[PDB]
Every structure is written in C-alpha cells, then in structure tokens.
Ligand binder design. Structure first.
Ligand SMILES: Nc1ncnc2c1ncn2[C@@H]1O[C@H](COP(=O)(O)OP(=O)(O)O)[C@@H](O)[C@H]1O
Ligand SMILES: Nc1ncnc2c1ncn2[C@@H]1O[C@H](COP(=O)(O)OP(=O)(O)O)[C@@H](O)[C@H]1O
Ligand SMILES: Nc1ncnc2c1ncn2[C@@H]1O[C@H](COP(=O)(O)OP(=O)(O)O)[C@@H](O)[C@H]1O
Ligand SMILES: Nc1ncnc2c1ncn2[C@@H]1O[C@H](COP(=O)(O)OP(=O)(O)O)[C@@H](O)[C@H]1O
Ligand SMILES: Nc1ncnc2c1ncn2[C@@H]1O[C@H](COP(=O)(O)OP(=O)(O)O)[C@@H](O)[C@H]1O
Ligand SMILES: [Mg+2]
Ligand SMILES: [Mg+2]
Ligand SMILES: [Mg+2]
Ligand SMILES: [Mg+2]
Ligand SMILES: [Mg+2]
Ligand SMILES: [Mg+2]
Ligand SMILES: [Mg+2]
Ligand SMILES: [Mg+2]
Ligand SMILES: [Mg+2]
Ligand SMILES: [Mg+2]
Lengths: 373, 372, 372, 372, 372
C-alpha cells in the first residue's frame, strides 16, 4: 500500500539472473531530459565492444510525439551523447550516457539549455569557475504521503529530526546509503549527505565542479536517485513544498567561485560579484524557475530558514539572507559564497549560465545578450 | 496478484541448484504447438556435451495432447534445428529448437520453417537481413495488467514512454533479467524500451541473416515466458491487450539486402517498396496466424498506426504502412521498416512473404508451388 | 510493531553496498546535541584515508536546528576528537566523534569533554582506569517493550536473568550484532548479559584510561542506536522504562588507580571511599543530566539499589551505594564500584566528579574554577 | 478509508436511543466560526418544549477557541434566529441557528446575516425568491474520493451523470439519509441528482423568500455534515477537489421577484440582467468567501465555464455567466439563473449582493452604508 | 483498538434482554473504592419494586479484596443513600449509591459523604446551589486516545472545539448514549460539548442543592463507565492524559446561594470571593483526591489555567482562578465560577470545602471538629 507492487517481486530471482557472465556485448543506457523541463527518459542499446571515450558512441533517435517535444509528421528527434559514466545498476563494462536533444532540422530543442551553457563556459574558460549545489528531496510512498509517516496523521513536532539517528528519527536511510555508494561507483562528484528538518527529508551535495560538468553531474545524480528509489519502491520528489503547513520546504543552494576569489584577498572579488548580483534580482529569480517564476514564489516566503522573495539581501554568516558568505571565508579573506534562492526543482544549466552572465560578463538589462558576451 | 508457485521459497531452489552436476548433460527440446502461437518443452539427459546441433538425436511426443494429430497415428517427431546455451541451468546444458513432422515424415501444419528455409536458400547470394521489434504486456494472474490499480486505471498517457521511477515503469526486473538471459544464451538482442502505457515494453532483435531470424525470435519468446514464470506473471503478445483508448501492440520488421546496403541502395529500396505496394492483401493475410483477423486489432489508424484498408509509404511518416528512416533518406543506403505485422505474428511466414514479394518478383494471390 | 523502514527488502541494499567504491573515503561526524542526551550525525567525502585523527578537517552545522543556538549567529563548529573504524561501511571509512564550540570559539553548554580532559591531564601520572555497565531496554515503535504481549505482560520475574530460549530472551540478534560491530570498530567492549525483565540487556566497557572512557561509551551508544535503527526497534536508556514492580536501569561505574592496583591498595580504596562519603549530594547532582531529577526515580531500595538520601558502603552488599567486590577484599587490591549513576548519565561528568572528589581532595558545593 | 468511530457497534447506540427521555428537552445551537465556512455546535437541556424561536434563551461560547476573539475579552454571545426539528434525536428536540456577537454587542466579522436581514426588510414588499444548487464531493478519511480505486482512477466521464448501478453511483445511502432528514427537519430540499463524476452529488434548496434562503442552506449543510459523520465519510465543498480533467463544483443561484413572476416579467428579467452586466468584479468579489481568491480554480474557459474576467448572458446557454431557461423565455415570465458562485459561497452575501445590485440600483464599488 | 468483549454479537444479547421479566426486580449497588476515585458494583434480586430508597436493605462486601480492610475483620457494610432508574436494564430495575462503613460501624476512610451531609444540613437554611463541569478523554484499549493515528498525532489545535464532521469529532456515539441514559436515569445532565482536542469531551451536571450534587456526579461517572464498557473504550479523568501541547482536563465548580441569586447579590458574591482569597492552599489540598499531588501537572500557566500558588479573580477572565460571568456582573445577580479543581476531584470534598470557607467562614488550617 505504501510501496509499489513491483517492489514486492522476489529480488533473489533477479540477482540470480544478474549473476550470469555477460560475454562480449556491452549495454549502454541513453538518458535525456523531456519536454516538461524536469523529467527524465531512458532506453537501452547493445554495442559490440566497450567504448573508451564518449566520442566513440553513436547517435540515436526517439519518437518526440510521445514525449511532448514534437508534433505532426516531423516527430523524430535526435540524441547526441554528451557525457559518459560507469553503470552501477549493471556493472562494468556497461555505461550510462547523457545526451542532448535536437529537432529534426538539427536545431536544439526548447528544453535543451546545455548548448548555450557550454557556449558561455567556453567563453569564460580562462577564469576556472567552480560550482557546488545542495539538492534536497522528500521520500514519498505510492499513496501520496511521505514515506513512514503515520497513516492519515503526522509525526511529532520538529526539532529531533535534523541529522538524527534512530528508528524514530530517520526514515529511509537505506535509499540514502545505496544512492551514495552508487554515485561513488559511477563517478559522480558527490560530496556528502545529511538528514533534514522533517523526517523522510534528506539532502546530498555535489561538487566542486568546473564549467559544464556541474549540470551533467547533477542530472546524472538525479537519474541515479530515481532509479534507486524505483528499486526500493518509493518516490523521490523535488517539489519545493512537498507538504502544506508549518513544515519545512525544499531548496537548492548554489556555491560559486573563480580563481581570483580562491586566490589570496579574493574577498574583494566576492564583494564585487555580490554588488553586481544585487542589481539583477528579478532576472535571476526568473532564471532559477523552470516554469518562469511559479515555483520560486512557492518556495521563497521567509520561513523554514529561507529568505523573502520581496527584496535582495546579503550578509556574512546570515542563513536568512538571499546571499550568504560563510564565516570561515570571511575570516580568511578568501573562498566562495552561497546563493540560497534557487528552488529544489531548478535547472543547473540555467542557474550556472545566469550566474556566469551576471558576475563575469557584466551583462545588464532584462534579456540575455544574443550572440556574444 | 501473482501465481502461487511464485510464493514458494526460492532460496531452497538456489541451494539445490548450487550442487555440482557431474558428467551428465541436460537438454530441453522446444517446439511450436498446433495453435501456431504456443510453445511446448520437455527435458532429457545426454551422456556428454554436444559440440554442434548435428550431434543431437531425434525425439518424439504425443500429438493428441497438443491438438496436432488424431486417431491411432498420434506420434509426432522432433528434429533439432538450432542450439543455444541454457540460461536457467548454465553450462554445459543446452536449449534446442526443433521442427515438427507427422508420423509419415511430412511437415506439420504449423511447421513453416521447412518452406521458409527452402526459400531462403534460393536467394542466399543476396544476404538478406532482418530485424524485428517485439511488443508485449505484463499481466497479473487475475487478468489485469501488472501493477495497475485494482479494478481501476492509472493516470493518462504521456509520462510512461521511456519513463523512470516507481510511478512510471512497472516490472523492470523482468526486463533486466530477460536481457541478461538472452545475452547469455546467445540470442541477437539489440535493445529495449518502455512503451506508451505502463506495464508495456518492447525488445528488438537483429540484424539476423536468413533463417536465423525466426529461430532467434522464437527462442527469445520462450526465454521471456520462462522468466515471467519464475517471477509469477504472464506475458501476452495480444495485439489489443486492454480495450479502449490505450495503446496496442505490434511487431515492426526491418529488411535490407547487400544491394540496399551498398552505396546508392536507396534506388533498390524504392523498387522493393514499389513492388510491395501491389500485394497489400497478400501480405496482410501472411502477417496473421489466423489468416487475416488479428490485423484489424492494431491497424485502426490511431496512436501512430496506418489504416488497414489502404497502403501508404513515406520517409518520416510514423503513421505510414512503410517507413524509410530519415537517416537512410539522407544517406542513400540502409534499410526500411514495415509496420503492418501484428505482435503475435510468425517470423517464418513474415520473412518468407517479404522475400517472395521483393526478391522473387512473385505475383498473384498464392505462393508459387515449386520454382519460387 | 517495527518501523516501516525495516520492511524495505534489505537484499537490495546489500547488492548496492557490495560495489568496490573506488578511491574516495566516507567520514561520519558525530556530536552531542543541546538536550545533553541525544546524538546527531552527517557524512562527508575525503580524497584519501586519514592515518590519524589530527589530519581530519573541521566542519560546522546549523545550531538553530538542534536548540544549541539562537539568532543570526547560529553557526557552530565541529572539532574532531577521536576516530574509529566504521562497521556500517567497512574499511577504509571512519567514524569521527567531535566536540562542539560556539561561533566565538567558546565551548558549548553540553560540551563537557573540554573541562573533563583539562582535569584528567592533572592526574595522568596516577593512571586512573574506568569501567561502566550500560543498561537498556528494547522497545517497539508503539511504545511498549519489544516482544511483550499486546496490551499485556509476560510472566513474573525470575526466569529472564541470563536466560536462554524463545520464551526467556527477547531480541538477541541486536545484542550479537552490536557486540560484533563494537569489536570491529575498536570500542573496548568487555561483555554482555540479559537482565531481570525480558527485552532488557546490558553491556560493559573498559577498563579505559583517562578521557578515552567517555568517548568509548558515547561511540558504543551511537553504534547501538544505528544497529537498532537497522532492525527497526528503539533502544532507550530511560532509568524507569516501565511502571510498576519491574526493575530500573543503572550505569554502575568502576574506578581504580595505580596505587589501588598495587599490592595493599585496599587502604587507598578505603580512603577514597571515606572521602566520597562526604559529597553525596554533589555526586548525585553530577550523575544526572538534568541536575538530579531522573536519579530519584531509580534509587528506591528495590532492584538491588540503595536509598537516594542515604550513603552506605560494603563489601558484598549489592544494595549499598558503594560496593567492594569480595575478591578485591580478599586480595587487598583491585577496584571498587559506584552504583549511583543512572542509565542516562554523562560519562564525562561522572568521571570528572570522581577524579575531583577522590584524587584532588576537592571540597565544597561547587567545582574549583580555574585549576584543580 | 472510513473513520474509526464508524466501526463501532451502532446497535448499542440504537438501543440507548430507544429509551423514552421524559419531560426534558434537548436543544442544539449552531453557528458559523471565524473562517467563514466552518460550523460549530453544542447542546443544552431545556425544561419544556419551546413552540417559538423567541422562547429560546441566549448563550455564549469561548471565542478564543474558534479564532474569533483574543485577549481577556474572549467571550462571545449568540442569539437564536431560526428553529427546526432535530432529525438525529427526533421530536421534541430541536435545532437552533444563531448569530454571533462580540463582548460588546456588535456583530462578529463573519456575521453577514445582520446586514442581509436589514437589506431584505427594506425590500420585502417585492417578495424576492431564491433557489440554490449545492454541489459537493464525498471523500474518505485518507484524502481521496470515496469509492475510488486506491491510488488510481475510474473510467472516463459519461456514465456517472444521473447514474444507477454499483459501478456508476457511489454512496447513495448518504444522499437518501440527508434527503429524508431534511424533509423531517423542515429544511426546503427541492431535489437531488448524481453529478458528472462518481462520489459527486447535488441537492437544490427549494424556492425560499428573502432571508430564509441563507438559513435553510446553512442548516442543510450542517445536516449533511452530521449524516456524513454518522457514515464515516467527509463532505467537501471545495470548488476543485480533484485536479485534472475531472468535473469541478459550484453553487448556482436562481432569482425572481413578483414582477418577474407576473405576466410579461421577461422585460424585468432583462432589466435585472442589464443592471448586473456592469457589476461583474463586485459580484465576483462578493461570491468568494475570502475576497475573490478561490473561484479562479474552476472558472477557466473550459467544461462549459465562462471566462472569469468576461461577463455574458443568453437563453438556454449553459456556457454563459447568466442563463435564461428556455421555458421562461417561451412563457415571457419566470426567473433567471446566475452560474458564477462557487461551492463554498456564503448565501447571505450572495443574496445581499443580488438585492443591492438589481433592486436598490447600487453602482459603487463598496456597499452603501444606509440603504442606497 | 477496542476490547475483545465489544466484538461479541450484540444481537444475541438484545434477544435475551427482550424476554419479559416477571415479578422480581434487580437492584445494582454502587460504592466508592479504597483509592478514593474508583467505583465498584454488584447486583441482588428483590421480591418487589421499592418505592423509596428507605425500602432497600443493607448489604456487605469483602473489604480485603478492595484494599480498604485487612485481617479477619475484613467485612464491610454499605448503606444505600440514593436511588435512580436503571438505564441498562429498564424499569422497574434500579441502581443504588451507598455509603461504606467498617465492621465497627465507623465510616470508611474514603467515605466523605458522611461529613459533607452534616455540613450541608447545618447550612441548609441558605439553600446552596452547585454546578460542575466534568471533562474527560476517550482512550482505546491500547493506551492511546481513541481515533488517533497509530503512533502519530492529528493536526494542530483549532478545528476540534465544538466540532462536527468525521475528521473533527471522535466518538460522538458514546456522548449521545450517555446523555440519553442520564436523562432516563434521572440525573441532572445540563449539557455537553466537544473539547479542544479530538476524543475529549465535557458534560455539565445541572444546578443541584446540597449533597445531591455529589450524588448526581458520582452516578453520572458510573453511567459513563458502563456505556464506554458497552462500546469497548475507556474513559479517563486523568488531569494530563497526553503530554505535550495538548489540552488538559479540569472540573470547574459553580456556586451560589439564595442571597447571591436574589437582587443585589453581587455584593455577597464579592464577599465570598474575598473570603476564599485567603484559603488558597487549603482549597488546593482539598481539591485533590491524593492530597495535593495530581493537580500540579495541570496548573502550569498554560491551557488558560491559573497559577498554582498565585490566587487571582476577575470578571470574564478565563485565566483567573475565580471568574465572574459578564452577565452576572451586568445583572448584579447570579453565581461565580471556581476553575481550580481538576478532573478527578471528589465532589463531596469540593462542596464541603466551599461551604466551610464561605458560609460559616472557617479560618484554621484543619476542618473544625464540631458544628462548623
Ligand atoms: N571553492 C569552492 N567553490 C565552490 N563551491 C565550493 C567550494 N568549496 C566547497 N564548495 C561546495 O560547497 C558545498 C557545501 O555544502 P554544505 O556544507 O551542505 O552547505 P551548508 O553548510 O550551507 O549546508 C559543497 O557541495 C561543496 O562542493
Ligand atoms: N541494415 C539493417 N537491415 C535490417 N535491419 C536493421 C538494419 N540496421 C538496423 N536494423 C534493425 O532495425 C531495428 C530498429 O529498432 P528500433 O530502434 O526499436 O525501431 P524504431 O527505430 O523504428 O523505433 C533494430 O532492431 C535493428 O536490428
Ligand atoms: N582494575 C579495574 N579498574 C576499573 N575497572 C575495572 C577493573 N577491572 C575490571 N573493571 C571493570 O569492571 C566491570 C565489571 O562489570 P560487571 O562484572 O558486569 O559488574 P557486576 O559484576 O557488578 O555486574 C568491567 O566492565 C571492567 O571493565
Ligand atoms: N420561480 C422561481 N423562483 C426562484 N427559484 C426557482 C423558481 N423556480 C425554480 N426555481 C429554482 O430553480 C432550481 C432548479 O434546479 P435544477 O433543475 O437542479 O437546475 P438546472 O435547471 O440548471 O438543472 C431549483 O433549485 C428551484 O428552487
Ligand atoms: N444559579 C446557578 N447556580 C449554580 N450553578 C449554576 C447557576 N446557573 C448556571 N449554573 C451552572 O453553570 C454551569 C455552566 O457550564 P458551561 O456553560 O458549560 O461552562 P461555562 O459557564 O464556562 O461556559 C452549568 O453546569 C450550570 O449548572
Ligand atoms: Mg547543506
Ligand atoms: Mg547551504
Ligand atoms: Mg522500436
Ligand atoms: Mg520501429
Ligand atoms: Mg554487570
Ligand atoms: Mg555492577
Ligand atoms: Mg441543477
Ligand atoms: Mg443550474
Ligand atoms: Mg463549560
Ligand atoms: Mg467553565
């Protein structure tokens, strides 16, 4: 009732079948983002030998009508591999492949932002920007309520669940442990995890990652989480407000730095970037939402350790400010700063592109520059 | 619900199966029954591991129990045709696909591999290749699709095609196990994907040369059935498993020859399609085990399907009867896809009809007796 | 009843955990929260395996979520103090016990290890050793002891102490797993036994020198909680887990020094006890996390306990406040046991109080401020 | 799915309710709380059966517990306004609807009957009539519509509207009990029917004059809540209880005066419609219980719902804001229908707004403080 | 969960109870336990229906089994004091409340009616009136409030007070049955209402004169217990049934005399309040069955409760120890409220203390021995 029917099949049988030696053929799983801008799709292929780099993989295609990314006769779409990882659900030599999507006429799809993001990162390469993001999520049963919660009721009040240990403090640690190990095996740049303010709510961190690798790593981590939860029979949701009422919301803070900031006395560069950021609050708010600003309003309300969407604010060691400069970097006059505005279901390509445009290209206005800068 | 057998303790079975086997070898004989759609099997012991299919001995079975014979002369003969590694018992055990003959050594009514191989031997120098996409639906023991709400329906279509997640894909364990088992056995499996409604999947076979296509597809079907039996669910190839607005199942066939695969083979592809355009009724009859009934189940003109009453072709047209992939159009060489055959088709008959229509230039509404 | 998490097919988790993991290393930071009894943890990734606790980096956490801070200056600091092998993830992963400091680098209110180590450093030449017996009861998620009849009671006391059998011992799996995990991690675990009421157990730690006792006990408690979480039950250190005639839970402490261990140390033991006899109220206050409210619930004469307001000593008297084992008395050397501390005590405070009273000749109603 | 209270043995309750009660009489008071949508009740004993609402005494309740007052002066008084027979306890016990007042005798924030009554009295000579159609949905305690498959959906729309059969109508027992209870109580129920989705129903409150419309509708809502409590389910008036392609909820209100009812009243109906055409925003604000912030979820230009920002009217048109029944149009006399109000509206405010705009010729964006 | 007895078939019992009785009648005796807050009962057959309580004979019971006697002289006698009709077995059967006496005819320790009656008789000239409000909570047999989620909590406070609906009021059947049974029996049941948390309720025992107040309250408690026994649940008068941010339980007592009820009685009300303001500790001790140890958990400044040691009074103040209703203040007539007593108080003790302090103005720390 709380978990899916698939999860009640005998898994020893599956393990027995998966123990069989594979042979010479190699399995590859293609992954891409769909038309909703936040869903993922996948399908499997057979190769004659193990590819040594992403350049050796061939292109593929899929039917766009059933994905809501095309209509009419010209429904075929193209898949172009972008990044490759080791497959933790199968094992070596099988692979996972993240792909970009293009229309029949070879133009990028509406939900394909990696193209422009890669362009901008190539433009600003020399400054070595690094990114780190903290993804929050809630584990849910198949009945629409959070996993492990009382049937038609609520747990005790908040306070004992943040970083808690015990059968009555943390729900669903098996998924978390499995996800951690799977990401490490695949090669995702996972940096840590912790339990959140309300039980069945968790978080994992990614990075620091340079340039375009941040988005690839985050998306692959999301796919791995979904697949693991599917194995266990529960649902993982990135919704900014999973449960109504007093209970905690969900967000995705972003950490950003450059070589100048990481060098000695980089605090001046950090402050300059903060000042530049202060002028583009509405633009960045619009960027951070996949739907144009609907979810940002739902998240940013001033509660559950989140700032208020009304106005931009910054400070040192201020958890409630829009921008946070940690005390350690403040004391050492170097390091990084954290942006706490982006919502849990954000798009890393958009977030990173907006940050680069605002801070390093000195862009201004309400629209991005078309060709260059 | 799942079967009662699936609720027995499988650790016990694993304990027994882990015992060293010894010197004897098990072989499982497989054949097609009188309905033209079902499969049957039984096991025997051999003194040593065979090295090729020619070393296996002939066998027999009682035809009255499979509705393939009547009267006193009910004995039927099994003749091995192709051999594979057994994924349910591991080396050195084998799976054997056999042809069926009557007591007087004539082919059985449902034995089409005889004529299919006869025809294939005629055009060997042209190296025809085939590839087929088998769709199926996973069903519970109660007659409803696996994982669906009890006496209800899941959400509308759109999020299930190639989906990932507990609420978007049902029964991936069966799919993964089937993939691995086919790879171990040596079936030429090429890929898989989830389909438009949940609990519906597809796997692809090929490219396969000549007669090997039918053998490979039939063995893949048998392996799927055995795996589902292990898990306690039912796999159905019915063209319309669930009534109403939901998606139907089919089996697309891809076909090419050496000339088509050579540079500027698009001309040959076009001539083959032109020839195909004049035998629509014949091919429709060939694609159905019953003889022209199951075709109307899927060719209703909905959810990317062509109307059964008319023939059509195109490059990117998913809804056309014949499809030439866009990449094949851009590069003047490759293959083309036929979308008419139903999910419960017979590969021997399908491939024989394609060869007859395209390479032998046959005409009329009946096959040529001996010369073609 | 057991938790919902405990029904999630642990075979899947084992499959995932059997992966090689490559070159990165996981570290779990552990610390004590604002209630003075709870524990909290979170994980971090390191580039290589640390060889000693000195090369681990500092960290921080949000104090507002653990009631240890308020206002804007809610950031707190974590400073590693002791390192152990991780039994839940195996080598090369680690567990790290940390001290807590405020934003201004002052120790937190619940951070007693600072002063405890300060005091212990003044007596190092005397080599004090400690050993503590932790009791606990296993409880279901519904608030009743694990394995007890639903809304009922088991038979009366007598057959459960050190018992064996399905009807005499409840939950030995947790005990065995905890024992093995502590041995693997390197905790100085000395033994275990079942207690007077079913589902009630005890484990012993030591002998431990100086400050290591407190961290060993705390890490043992954390490991117990994690194991119970795996099995889906709750472990409680509450001094009176169930109302009525059933026995409470204590944390008897054993103490000795080099002089007592040496020949004819019984005289030193007697002087230490005579000194302890004059600070009953001070030690009672020290032994309780909340200032002395929980201890009154246990010391009532029953369950082999002494009166709360009366100090007494003896050799074989288990009902006295201080106990000198008979073998120690006969051999004129060894140790003595203090039976006052409650099950939810803080070892840092307990050991600090013992040291200050016995070896520093401290007197008065409050501890010495600066030194000694 | 159903509440724990509904699983108790109802035969025990019935045997208790069969006792003859004697000379005393029970009276249940009902009032509207601070949210403006919820209802509260409690009971007091009376010495003899009252024969007129004027005979019932005043009472009071704690306003701080219903979010209607704060501080020391939290007492609130309620004044009975209407009386009905009690269908749950039978004669001579009674139901009483009351108005709320602050510690100083001023109406509470959610007391709209006070002004509605004055507005009705200053127009009584024209004898306005009202008729309202309340839609609602039955929900289980788990949060899903009653009788729906767990985590799934029933078939598409089309068979449920005014349906009959186990697979087409869910929970008709509640509807029957409510209808009979209303008839016994004296509330004006005019009819009922099953709506476009299963577990969704509708009941009309017959033609009432002036202020009695709101009283009857509020008492009907209370009786529905009480009956659903007996059965173990929840009745919700949410305009959009289930997102997706599933029908929503509203409460249409029909209006008529003596002039319209008389011969050639169609011209007066047209005049009223023309007057209403210029107060769209004001009426939209008045019809939503919380200042025009919830009805937008339903009015979206689909499912025969007109655009929220666009006003339209027509004859026999169910897609317009205002509809003139075809029979009324043909007879040149009758009434007209307003389709804008949602399911959770306040009838007092709705009727007051209609009177103000159509009969008192008010034009401003705020109510006129003394008549018009 | 509910008791096993409540799952038996109640139709069988009803069939049996339908049998005509005959000439004999049953009488059920009731008396207060040795704990001072428990009730016991048993039944004897009588030849004829008694007309008045004076016709009932004396009886006895084993005091050693109720923990109010010891040794050989364990017999105890009970003397009937009040009689009512029996609602569980209809007319002519009866139930009788009795006083307890020792073997030597000295009143038992928990017999307070003996002295309460003397005080009331000595002060009868002024005709004191009393009214009390009993709060209680319905518990399942597993130890949690009835209808609460297993191991969880309902939503926060606010919707349950005087609530209606399946999700807002739990177990109204018990309340209805108890109300009707009390009315049939003949006790004053003045009214009822749902309380701040679900499964918590209140009933008020109407204006009684003299010891009749205590008699009626005790009989009402007995009736509640028997009805809850029929339904399978437990009723608890614990001051703090559920710890945390959840409402407690008290027993408010309203007092008045003829002078207070007469015109310009507010002066006497103020005089009585002033007299009470000096015996706060004495009244706190008297309002607790144990001697002033249980009400502490209730009075903490929360739930609108008064301070434990700071007496206060006011008009329309819920937070004060004594409150004067606003209507009483405005009319200069009526009564005043004492909000100190907890749920498990003894009405005889409460009324006796009020009489002693207010009417004959005692001042000592102990009750006066002779006629005071
Ligand atoms: N120099 C840097 N530049 C950018 N990001 C960094 C840098 N150093 C660390 N980070 C990132 O900061 C993140 C810290 O996240 P976390 O400690 O969970 O945030 P918080 O303390 O606000 O909860 C890590 O994911 C890490 O990748
Ligand atoms: N040269 C060829 N001749 C015949 N078949 C081919 C050739 N190349 C590929 N195929 C087959 O075409 C099939 C395409 O499968 P799939 O991608 O599932 O269908 P679609 O692209 O129509 O969705 C594969 O199974 C493959 O075996
Ligand atoms: N010389 C010593 N100094 C301090 N502690 C000691 C010494 N020798 C043994 N101990 C401790 O005494 C404890 C004995 O506990 P246990 O036998 O369970 O107590 P009991 O016999 O009272 O049940 C062990 O945990 C051990 O570490
Ligand atoms: N003369 C009238 N004045 C006011 N209301 C009327 C008059 N005649 C009928 N009605 C109301 O019209 C409503 C018709 O309800 P119903 O038939 O369910 O709606 P519909 O006609 O849209 O299907 C009834 O509630 C009834 O009270
Ligand atoms: N003249 C009076 N003398 C004594 N008691 C009275 C008098 N009038 C009313 N009461 C009592 O006051 C109580 C009022 O109870 P209730 O209204 O439930 O609580 P509250 O007054 O706090 O709202 C009743 O129990 C009733 O018996
Ligand atoms: Mg973080
Ligand atoms: Mg952060
Ligand atoms: Mg395909
Ligand atoms: Mg295809
Ligand atoms: Mg011991
Ligand atoms: Mg001991
Ligand atoms: Mg209608
Ligand atoms: Mg209508
Ligand atoms: Mg009251
Ligand atoms: Mg009161």
């Amino acid at each position: 009732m709380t978990t899916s029917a698939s999860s009640h099949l005998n898994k020893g049988i599956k393990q027995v079948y998966m123990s069989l030696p594979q042979g010479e053929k190699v399995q590859a799983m293609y992954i891409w983002i769909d038309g909703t801008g936040e869903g993922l799709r996948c399908k499997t292929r057979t190769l004659d030998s193990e590819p040594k780099c992403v350049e050796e993989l061939p292109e593929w295609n899929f039917d766009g009508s059933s994905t809501l990314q095309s209509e009419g006769s010209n429904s075929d779409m193209y898949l172009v591999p972008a990044a490759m990882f080791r497959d933790p659900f199968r094992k070596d030599p099988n692979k996972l492949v993240l792909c970009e999507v293009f229309k029949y006429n070879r133009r990028p799809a509406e939900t394909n932002l990696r193209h422009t993001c890669k362009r901008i990162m190539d433009m600003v390469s020399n400054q070595h920007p690094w990114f780190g993001m903290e993804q929050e999520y809630t584990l849910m049963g198949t009945d629409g309520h959070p996993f492990g919660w009382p049937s038609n009721g609520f747990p005790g009040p908040q306070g004992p669940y943040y970083c808690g240990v015990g059968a009555d403090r943390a729900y669903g640690r098996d998924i978390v442990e499995a996800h951690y190990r799977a990401c490490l095996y695949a090669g995702v740049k996972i940096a840590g995890t912790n339990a959140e303010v309300m039980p069945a709510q968790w978080e994992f961190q990614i990075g620091p990652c340079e340039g375009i690798s941040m988005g690839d790593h985050l998306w692959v981590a999301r796919f791995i989480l979904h697949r693991v939860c599917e194995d266990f029979g529960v649902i993982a949701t990135f919704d900014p407000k999973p449960i109504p009422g007093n209970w905690n919301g969900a967000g995705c803070h972003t950490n950003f730095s450059t070589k100048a900031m990481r060098e000695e006395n980089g605090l001046k560069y950090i402050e300059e970037a903060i000042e530049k950021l202060s002028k583009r609050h509405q633009y960045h708010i619009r960027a951070y939402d996949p739907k144009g600003g609907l979810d940002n309003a739902a998240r940013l309300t001033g509660f559950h350790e989140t700032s208020n969407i009304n106005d931009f604010s910054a400070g040192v060691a201020n958890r409630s400010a829009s921008i946070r400069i940690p005390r350690t970097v403040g004391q050492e006059k170097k390091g990084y700063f954290e942006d706490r505005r982006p919502s849990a279901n954000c798009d890393p390509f958009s977030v990173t592109e907006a940050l680069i445009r605002t801070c390093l290209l000195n862009e201004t206005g309400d629209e991005p520059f078309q060709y260059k800068n």
